[PDB]
Design a protein around this ligand. Sequence first.
Ligand SMILES: NCCc1ccc(O)c(O)c1
Length: 376
Amino acid sequence: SRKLILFIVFLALLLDNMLLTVVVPIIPSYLYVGLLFASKATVQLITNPFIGLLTNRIGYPIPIFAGFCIMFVSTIMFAFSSSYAFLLIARSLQGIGSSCSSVAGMGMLASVYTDDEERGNVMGIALGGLAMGVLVGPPFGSVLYEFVGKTAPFLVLAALVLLDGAIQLFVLQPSRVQPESQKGTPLTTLLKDPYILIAAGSICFANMGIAMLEPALPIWMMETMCSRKWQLGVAFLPASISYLIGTNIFGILAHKMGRWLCALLGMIIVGVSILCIPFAKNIYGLIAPNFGVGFAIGMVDSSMMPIMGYLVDLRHVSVYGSVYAIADVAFCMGYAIGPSAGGAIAKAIGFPWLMTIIGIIDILFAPLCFFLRSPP
Ligand SMILES: NCCc1ccc(O)c(O)c1
């Protein structure tokens, strides 16, 4: 009965991304900024290598329970605060707790589900938690902020975090410190690998595309089409639905089509969709490209996590904390400098030129995935 561990990392990923998206609508209205948004991803980027090394010394359960303790503290602090410095502290602590949760949970999943096919099948479900969290965050925050009050969403999130922590105490039971049997191959050796670098680069560019697309699209919309506020929110919904669908189906479907081919087609499709986005004239023209973008990115992610796990087992020692720290660093890098660089480029040159450059880069990087195919 290892489904409980899958349930733990599903809930930790779900609740963490629920808090990530509930806070974004509330903070600007309550306060009145770029540093605060990027503080979570920057701090999480820095602590990823240290969590990767710490799991090899003491194991996964203590870092996981510690992640819940940091997330619980961050949630209560957000609800009770009202100052900018405390907001920075809380978001930075979430960045630390999210790093712990992501790295330790992914390593524990890779260490519990050792089979190659089952690993991808369960990582699809686990990555579905992120998509569900981003899907249900904003409406949850909106309703509890509308009716009950400002602190109600945070208090309900804290209650769910307490429930999650109690389940963790019952199942994980972080009572003693247990070191891993073998050393894990230091980060310097792994960063010299060209195949790990190719997989990380594909993840980084695919996610950096959407990282720039998401905040830069409403500004172009409100000037080109003069769209209503409700449309600005419901226009990106196809991407979030298609991400869930594609992640959950391609977790199983990528092993038969071939992980390299699924990643290659994902990069090609996301590049073509990003290239066609500037040609749209209204929301109905934007429905299809966003669906394509979400589908392709789900393809890339659900094909590229188990490939990272496979690469460490194929030519290095089977210890997953450091390599999944590398993968998390790849994700955070796109989400840290994404919005600011995107805004700078879209101010220097047009939004269509930014979209064209992103699409061209993705299409040109796409053939690099050919080297990821297995020798036999
Ligand atoms: N790696 C997750 C990429 C992603 C998918 C859907 C989203 O809505 C989003 O903001 C980000």
